[PDB]
Subunit: 227 residues, 3 copies
């Protein structure tokens, strides 16, 4: 079908574009602004990595991020899936943004670490765009970090360490009962100077790996770290 | 255990009847209307199928649907389980409704299609009853269709195609952050003339099968299709 | 890592202490009362058992229970995981409470019964403490019973029978859509005289076993029963 753009085994992620959406359907979608041309990125496993990949798609095109929704999923693991809707006036521009997001998944899964007992996720950008803003609460135009661990108490200690490492501005802390879809994740989000934000995210990574390893298995990443 | 009526491997579904429920317990249950005789249908996998099966049970007896509740479940998949409470004055009537519901499971899973990456669900009736109304938002006395895909973005495209196929009336569109238990499903519900609703549901099926197949596996149904 | 206290294979449970938590983080944690020393118990599988183990920790130390949060988890099963935060003035007292919690897991999983289709959980104490109060709604200083079944309809029948066995006071009934994180559990909580509360919890256990066994498998417990 013409609406299909591509699919990836990374997170069971599918990208599609609707050139002219039915108006009655559009009136039922919870979007920030209606556009007739929609891009759709949808996955079983991952929230942060697809959101950061879509930020690159936004930087590369005239598309706007208009909805981010939050399935509890990861196919039985402890985290989220993701639905991201983008909007613009040009179907070609929408396909390009979805293609760029698909091509960035192997990078944004760079600091996702898996084990039988749980997982860690780290994200970093020197300049956040629209998807990171709508999806993760980033301040647009500024540095952003994300520091997350599962089961959730690991994320609390990762967060304590990150804040003690450098002078950064906390945006939010989300947990199983507040700001997640009852996931088993503790997540610190921050802004500040880019060098300080990087320092804090790297500190969180080191303590998170040490703690998750105490269940007996070295946490494994499937792609090279970008941070 | 006199309360037990039967159990089915389809959906891990169990049906029970309480002839005269304890008043203290009844006062803590979240029902639309109090009755002393309760039937209970409870499952790990499925919402829609058990709800459409119960609609036949309601048509067959004098029982009323008084609660429908929404576990996020499917034993690690992207969907819902279900709790249905029915109320009346006659224990034999309640047991008959539960038996009719269990007997209809093999039919109402006829258009559920499974794959490693996700699933599709379609439902259709020429005349909806009280369980379809309370559970899925159907208009009682009218034709009803349900069109669902997972991961949720597939459900958005299915919905668009259905509405463009025939003149039908939209009821709702539910998604991971609106009107589900943080499931990974996009679901369009419709009414209209029975022939038009049937055409829309069949169109949604065709595009959903094409899209979900793009992950590499043809979606599988375990039972003959009824639609 | 000096924050690490211990890890258990039972429920994938990890315990940690932060001697002096960062103040910006503390302001973003959802606690009843601020303390500078935090203990943290975090797991993938179990709510009631870790909460009951933590009630012993509280009895043994000067720590106060200040948060209980509710991941929908059990690694693809029908239940919850758990995050428990405790607070006090002394890091040694915190580590002792976490230690006592870890050491009681093998007891508080004594009346958890598992099967392919679902699970049962019973808890009992003659005198509830701060964790059972915050996490499960117990009345501090009184006897307390928890009676749960999955899929949730089984919990409804267990609750009805328990109430019919002895004169007890219902505290709450939680279900997929009310007072759970969209879990597939029906759970009755009770107080009253210790003898009558034990009577009721034991009656709920018997009927739960009989019903869950209707799917074809004798439910299995991994530790000796304490009730």
């Amino acid at each position: 079908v013409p609406e299909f753009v591509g699919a990836s085994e990374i997170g069971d992620t599918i990208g599609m574009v609707i050139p002219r959406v039915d108006q009655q359907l559009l009136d039922k979608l919870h979007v920030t602004k209606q556009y007739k041309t929609l891009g759709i990125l949808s996955d079983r496993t991952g929230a942060g990595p697809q959101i950061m990949a879509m930020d690159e798609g936004i930087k590369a095109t005239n598309m706007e991020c208009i909805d981010v929704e939050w399935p509890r999923d990861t196919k039985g693991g402890g985290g989220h899936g993701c639905l991201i809707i983008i909007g613009g006036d040009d179907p070609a521009d929408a396909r390009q943004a979805i293609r760029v997001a698909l091509d960035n998944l192997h990078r944004t899964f760079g600091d996702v670490y898996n084990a039988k007992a749980g997982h860690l996720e780290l994200q970093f950008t020197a300049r956040a765009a629209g998807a990171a803003h709508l999806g993760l609460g980033a301040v647009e135009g500024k540095a952003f970090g994300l520091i997350c661990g599962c089961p959730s108490g690991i994320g609390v200690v990762m967060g304590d360490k990150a804040l003690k490492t450098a002078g950064v501005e906390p945006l939010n802390f989300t947990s199983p009962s507040h700001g997640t879809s009852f996931s088993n994740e503790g997540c610190l989000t921050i802004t500040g100077d880019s060098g300080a934000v990087r320092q804090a995210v790297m500190a969180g990574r080191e303590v998170g790996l040490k703690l998750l390893s105490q269940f007996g298995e070295e946490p494994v990443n499937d792609f090279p770290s970008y941070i």
